[PDB]
Design a protein around this ligand. Structure first.
Ligand SMILES: Cn1ccc2ccc(-c3cn(-c4ccc(O)c(F)c4)nn3)nc2c1=O
Ligand SMILES: Cn1ccc2ccc(-c3cn(-c4ccc(O)c(F)c4)nn3)nc2c1=O
Lengths: 114, 114, 114
């Protein structure tokens, strides 16, 4: 899986260990080994949510499977929770796009997973 | 909705009011309250368009509904106009990926919209 | 088409002719005209792959057609090889998401490609 967060929160407010915690929590949440989890945190972004420049985040989670109605609610509770607690971002200022990728459409190690 | 602009135009050339202008214009274009519009502008990018490093933009608009053949042609005109006037980017150097997102694949406020 | 690379490799390790090389190689690989190929490289990113902060990349290729099982494996070999030779990133630490976009969902110069 691959989780990306873009945020206007400054780099110095991202706690040490944040990418490790995300790796670990997403491994548990998706059922995928942590070896397969990629994480990407982009701070200091020029962005707005509802025309306000208060802290916000735009995120995506791509996974081959493990995407759906109930699961995405669960990911959103987990991920909004972490962004609120570690980055101090209110949950109603977070968007997360979920993508169920077909294995044939995911390249890795000179090939694809199909 | 979620609107993102990646561009090689330097940060100093992005006007301070561009995010708010995009928010308002997108709110009218989509018929959605401004509070739910998120906008993200990423300047100083290392990019090329047609092999040229003249100013260009790679963009995306995510939305639950309000996406489709005719609406997207309308959006391209609105967004090329804004990018051309505010960022001085030629409209034939602008790409916009449109995404019609399922409500169950959009997380917000600890849940999804489904 | 549109090709993006996000990587933790430093800005200084990106060869000067890298954008041009990606443009030329993707034209050959997809058969699309080079005038319509956009490339985007984002270095110095805070990211982890498999819990590790060794060099990695998260990439995407959007195209109207020319996306499929066999082609994606060919693209992966081409692009992973380019990232290994030019950015010294191991292919086993690269993900590439492929997107077959509908022509009506790709905006360009005040319209779409539909
Ligand atoms: C009339 N009305 C009222 C409230 C509302 C509240 C929210 C939305 C809404 C939010 N998205 C959205 C945001 C980010 C994304 O990344 C994404 F894919 C989709 N699309 N629609 N729409 C409405 C709406 O249309
Ligand atoms: C023969 N011929 C002629 C003109 C042309 C003109 C344009 C394209 C074209 C553009 N995309 C594209 C760009 C950005 C995206 O973000 C995306 F999703 C898709 N894919 N194909 N193709 C052709 C083409 O194939």
């Amino acid at each position: 899986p691959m989780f990306i967060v873009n945020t206007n929160v400054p780099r110095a407010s991202v706690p040490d260990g944040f990418l490790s915690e995300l790796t670990q929590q997403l491994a548990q949440a998706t059922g995928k080994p942590p070896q397969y989890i990629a994480v990407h945190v982009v701070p200091d972004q020029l962005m707005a949510f509802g025309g306000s420049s208060e802290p916000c985040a735009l995120c995506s989670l791509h996974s081959i499977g493990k995407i759906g109605g109930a699961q995405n609610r669960s990911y959103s509770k987990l991920l909004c929770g972490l962004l609120a607690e570690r980055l101090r971002i209110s949950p109603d200022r977070v968007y997360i796009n979920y993508y169920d990728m077909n294995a044939a459409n995911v390249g890795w190690n000179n090939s694809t997973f199909a």
